[PDB]
């Protein structure tokens, strides 16, 4: 029970390494963190248990925490999101990794647990992207809690659960809600899904986007990026919403807002961008035009009533991996992607490296704070300082070559703000 | 010193009334406020002293506070923003108004003061769009303070000043920062300027936008709307910024971000969207291509070094009202609009009615809260509740015919939010 | 009957001249033609009878033909398109002009005739923008025909008529269909209306474009530009078409194509971009939403059933010049612009100078060809050579600063085309 | 030498059939052709020798000519474009096919030849996508010429060669230049590359498009679609052109036009869209930013100086199939895709089915004309009638659900055109 790592095939490393090379040039934030802190080794003594989809970009993250001098043990937060050659490299790198494609629920749980203990004791830091690493511990390894200094969550569902545990006096460790940074929120949510929604759809169906009517349920950040992605292609986007402010937003950009009920008749493509359930049900499926393409990029296979399909469907033919085509009792066909799960993760390579570098530099900064500024973070879920958000940004202005103008004493004075200090109030919405 | 009103020409009413008719159909918010509260007359006993550019939209605002039963005395917050026929109507309507186009600094001040006293005593409520109505009182009419229940500011410069006075124990009245509502911030800043930046430029120069290189300094809300407006026309927009998150924002939309110095060589059109000073100086002007069109939509004639022009310019020819053309010592001409002032306000009819309906419904709500819920607002600068913001929005979804989807018990539950209650956290940035 | 000119007020000149100055910097084409031919005076002995809306841009045109050494006599092709101060300048310039705003049908015809005879005999060249100058002659002044060397038409309706007369052996002069040049078709049709459709609507109604559903009948060039203009603002555009290729074109850009019948129910704004009649009829009007804004930019007040309005409308109130609002027997109002006429011409200053510079340089070239290469053009309607179209273009690449790459011997060869010669086949569609 | 077919693996069929099913729902044109002519069997007696990349869409094409009753023998016009499972199906279908992935030059030539003879004699009809099937015959099988009734080319390089042979009295068969139909040109060139440029780049590099500066050489149709594709993503596109009309075109859409020389310094991504050579050479490569991504979608590996790379490059590492990364003597890396060949064809699944359905229906129609109207087409290269172009379109308006408005006697008359007849002149450019 004392393995050094458990990946699909160690062989893949050489190639996995080829990728981490190309990818690193696209992740300025992490690479900067490496420069600025590789010497300081500000993470020494930290034993980080990371639970985040084991991909090429996470590899760059893992090697960045190590470079900042820290012990790390990783396990993918998803059973399918792993990239064996990515995990290959990290293993060959002499780093404990317990990740591989399509593992069983039992294997998953196993994987995570393998990151709990180091050879100098148990973990003292948690890096989560869903709270599985946090929940598991809190409820099965209470012992270790007193030994953990911090937790950095980056997911809505994880962050929330943190607020809950804290609200119910269960949280026994300070956490930093990384997800609510602007550079983390916008990228992981808006630019991220915008760049990879169609990729997922293309690789799956290779269908033409233009000229098609695409229904997008939810106008949040993710919904916004998808709506902008689909429209950039020539499709006519229709939006459904429950929040009147977001719905106004949509209408002001030219989209048509209506209910899924009315909408399910018009759509050609259907993307669900919510953390809500029962977005698309049988009464909708039976209205859809022949060969409608349904897929979800929200967060769980909980937005599409997949079950109904597998139930009220005549035949279910599998065109290919993660692309099935159900036959309705009315003659119409229904192309369902990723089996209802996240289409960009299930049909594409997830989000680009540059995007991840933004949400991941936030992650590296949370570790540093949490493990170097304990006094600053009492038990509760905290937010990263704004001056540090701007920091994640500025570190990316190089890659794309943008010349940032620098305020001047007079100006700064006039504005009443530090020439380098935070440039906006905390409630600023960008 | 006891006049009932002071407008340019009372005659204009008939026509001004023609406008308030057309205009009302474009301002659902306010018109809804009249429906929902015309009976309750929730503003009874309130004597509101309003200082907001006296336009056709403000007229609809004024008549809306009156319908909600309240005494009102108005004066434009600007010497040129007034629309004599709009002010005409309101006068004929038996409402004290002291506004007219281009008044003198002495007249302006005079105008404001005429709204201070009613025939039942002095004011008890303040509606400001710059803090001039607020400042003037606090420093020349301290008596009346104890008599004032609230203040509702809608301008950055006014809001700030409130925070200050409060910070220095000067503010002696609770205020509601109306400007930070989503439905007010976005419309008054983004959509507002987006709809009218080019209009002001067109009427002024009637120039062709497409094919031109337009330089926009500042990627805030206003900058965002102008950048989107100019690009929709075919211009190649370049942006300058001091904030690394806004600059990243820009770059992610395809714009080129650089410094004004480098930029002043390329630009054909120049729009300044900041609350900053010395954005465009002589060293820029002397770089600009022949016949460059310079104008500012920020907030004051403080962003362009007009002075330098009037100083280092050979001849200054006035093509027409609010449109001058300076001749440089190098052969290049410089078309300067609105004399450096707000171009949409000085070369156009400002923002549209529908937009105004949003930021103004917020205004009406602040009045009701502040004067119906004093207990709730101790002296300080407060924010309008979120459930109310959504309210301003929902009231506009009709005009544009958008079908809002309604959450369901199960859903609502799953999401952990009231089926009607606020759908988003307070830090939500939309 | 021998006046030297007939303009509204000669005084206006000083100001008209102010305009021609600013304007000339925006019309590189004509200004280049002036350089390249001011010396050659390639138009000597040519007596041009010009009939084109007498505006500031036409003035720059007029002075450009003269500079190329030619006698010119002008009359506007429209009774309202004229710009008195523009015509003023040209008169003070010692040039026969018979144009002024809103002249009577009898005055119009008069005006045209005054350009027929010079003090060395009658005209020998025709520059028409509607065929009124061409028709009039052919049927009332046959004598002069044998004396006229050429005709240059730039309008669909004028061009067609030429093809007809020619088809029926009536055409007695060679003509050059200038309208079908790329640089003239695209600018006068697409970029032209795109830049000024909304300006027209703003000045007229000052209404907010965003969030509205705009119906555009016809997806030709003009319709394409209007649809792109309206969408850049945030409106949701719907398109109607009779040609299946244009309709598919629309659908591939994300617009929704449907019939006016179904569309008339949704629309908030209505732009007709055809040369067809009966596009919007009573059965539509009685379907439109309250305060719908109807206007036409096609070519004649023949696309909207204005008549029906004036007939089946209860009351017709005139909000202001060129903006009326009919009241229907059902409670809905209808804002009708420019009285059914060209809205950009009737509510704005028409197209911008730079656009005009393109379609007018085409015009200047036709004159030169037709009058310097008679042998090349036998009686019939001809097209401007392609090498010359590219010429009109190359002449504008300077204003907007574009670095045109130059083919190289090896390349040119490989491509099989002249390094400077036409780069494209004649059926090329750009 | 009498094989019935030669494909990679016959087994693949079942799956290939799976595809042809899904695909057929996206190609309304061909599916319509099947309806309208399945009975007539208007192609009876025709023995078609098809040479077109053997993919899933060509499969649908092949089965469409057969359904119209015709013998067919196919061979891919490219050595790599073939799709073994697609070819699989067609073989299992009892159809002579000689296609498989990556065949040798000797094999290719062999494959083509296998379609020349049927069991009732040689071919009497040619369907070419490059003229390899035409050339080969004309120069090695002159006998058969007199036996061939028609040739339908769809490629620039093929069409041209036709005009040549004809110009040099070599062409001994009438041909129909299908490529110049609007529905074929626009789709195969504009919409086609627009939908699949980024897909090719994504699968290849999985790089993030937004925030990047993309250089596109050539503003033709393909260049136009690529430029619109990249911009919709958020990149800043810069264009290079030799044609002044296209360069103006670009500048009027907001792009920046300049020379490759100057541009090669700025670019992050480089797409070459010409039929020209030596677009990107060593002097450029040595200027490119680190990790620049170079790829070409023109028509041959002739636009990028690949050779130079393989010559002046230190090391060339192969990241993966069709994705190499050269290391320069200056430290910068250069990611070269598809080895310089067509990136959408070499890194993606080419163009979508719907697009192909357009350019392929054109193809089916040319066969019918050419083989049912010989008398109509004397030896020379002809264009498909316009009434038939609109036909290809109308046939697709269904899929996307667009309601085509139908002219009316009065209207039609007014317009002077047949209510169903062609709605536009031949020189119309859409
Ligand atoms: N797949 C990915 O790469 C990825 C990346 C980030 C986030 N996400 C997930 O996507 C989901 C949405 O994220 P977000 O940042 O846009 O959230 P968000 O909170 O900004 O927006 C969600 C939107 O859903 C709308 N909505 C809720 N219930 C609805 C219903 N029944 N019908 C229509 N609209 C409804 C809400 O009004 C809201 O505006 C989350 O579950 C999130 O974790 C996925
Ligand atoms: N004319 C109008 O109708 C109208 C309506 C609303 C607001 N405004 C005014 O416009 C201004 C901007 O408003 P906003 O809502 O976008 O503000 P904002 O705070 O959102 O953005 C201002 C932006 O300016 C940038 N900036 C500051 N100094 C700069 C400099 N020297 N060079 C380049 N960029 C610089 C900042 O980084 C910031 O992103 C304010 O003065 C505001 O009151 C005008
Ligand atoms: N106001 C201006 O500044 C200006 C400038 C140039 C041209 N025009 C005029 O605009 C008109 C259109 O010009 P264009 O260049 O786009 O012409 P166009 O020939 O390219 O397109 C006209 C379009 O109208 C469509 N159409 C015809 N009848 C229709 C109907 N009943 N319903 C729906 N669609 C219908 C046609 O299918 C066609 O695509 C002409 O009369 C032209 O002279 C006006
Ligand atoms: N890969 C595909 O799927 C696909 C599909 C259709 C066409 N094509 C090919 O793409 C190429 C271009 O097709 P198109 O329809 O756009 O052609 P096009 O003739 O419409 O445009 C080519 C453009 O290249 C420009 N150009 C030529 N030499 C240049 C140079 N040295 N520098 C800059 N610009 C230069 C020309 O001015 C012209 O506008 C052709 O070889 C064509 O066969 C590829
Ligand atoms: N390439 C990637 N590497 C790591 N995490 C990713 C990638 N693409 C998407 N994600 C993550 O997917 C999560 C949702 O499962 C998001 O929080 C997002 O950060
Ligand atoms: N038409 C209008 N009526 C009243 N205020 C306006 C109008 N257009 C713009 N404004 C105001 O101009 C202010 C800046 O001077 C903004 O806060 C905005 O709300
Ligand atoms: N400013 C202008 N000066 C001269 N002609 C114009 C102008 N704007 C539009 N036009 C002309 O309007 C004609 C249609 O009436 C078009 O052929 C176009 O060239
Ligand atoms: N999926 C496809 N099937 C067949 N031909 C294709 C496909 N995608 C692109 N092409 C062809 O690629 C050719 C250039 O090699 C184009 O003429 C185009 O029609």
mmCIF file of C-alpha atoms in Angstrom, chain A residues 291 310 313-328 333-336 339, chain D residues 18-19 21-22:
data_model
loop_
_atom_site.group_PDB
_atom_site.id
_atom_site.type_symbol
_atom_site.label_atom_id
_atom_site.label_comp_id
_atom_site.label_asym_id
_atom_site.label_seq_id
_atom_site.Cartn_x
_atom_site.Cartn_y
_atom_site.Cartn_z
ATOM 1 C CA UNK A 291 -30.864 14.947 -35.425
ATOM 2 C CA UNK A 310 -32.242 5.555 -22.173
ATOM 3 C CA UNK A 313 -35.858 5.696 -26.521
ATOM 4 C CA UNK A 314 -36.449 2.971 -29.093
ATOM 5 C CA UNK A 315 -32.835 2.200 -30.035
ATOM 6 C CA UNK A 316 -29.594 3.737 -28.869
ATOM 7 C CA UNK A 317 -26.812 3.482 -31.429
ATOM 8 C CA UNK A 318 -23.259 4.482 -30.487
ATOM 9 C CA UNK A 319 -21.766 6.427 -33.409
ATOM 10 C CA UNK A 320 -18.449 6.572 -31.539
ATOM 11 C CA UNK A 321 -16.706 7.303 -28.171
ATOM 12 C CA UNK A 322 -18.769 9.861 -26.240
ATOM 13 C CA UNK A 323 -21.195 10.303 -29.145
ATOM 14 C CA UNK A 324 -24.488 8.374 -29.061
ATOM 15 C CA UNK A 325 -27.626 8.700 -31.189
ATOM 16 C CA UNK A 326 -31.007 7.802 -29.662
ATOM 17 C CA UNK A 327 -34.075 7.053 -31.817
ATOM 18 C CA UNK A 328 -37.391 8.495 -30.653
ATOM 19 C CA UNK A 333 -32.981 11.159 -33.872
ATOM 20 C CA UNK A 334 -31.055 12.715 -30.971
ATOM 21 C CA UNK A 335 -27.256 13.023 -30.958
ATOM 22 C CA UNK A 336 -26.227 13.113 -27.294
ATOM 23 C CA UNK A 339 -23.171 10.934 -22.263
ATOM 24 C CA UNK D 18 -22.940 4.540 -39.810
ATOM 25 C CA UNK D 19 -21.373 7.793 -40.971
ATOM 26 C CA UNK D 21 -26.299 7.892 -42.445
ATOM 27 C CA UNK D 22 -25.522 10.740 -40.077
#
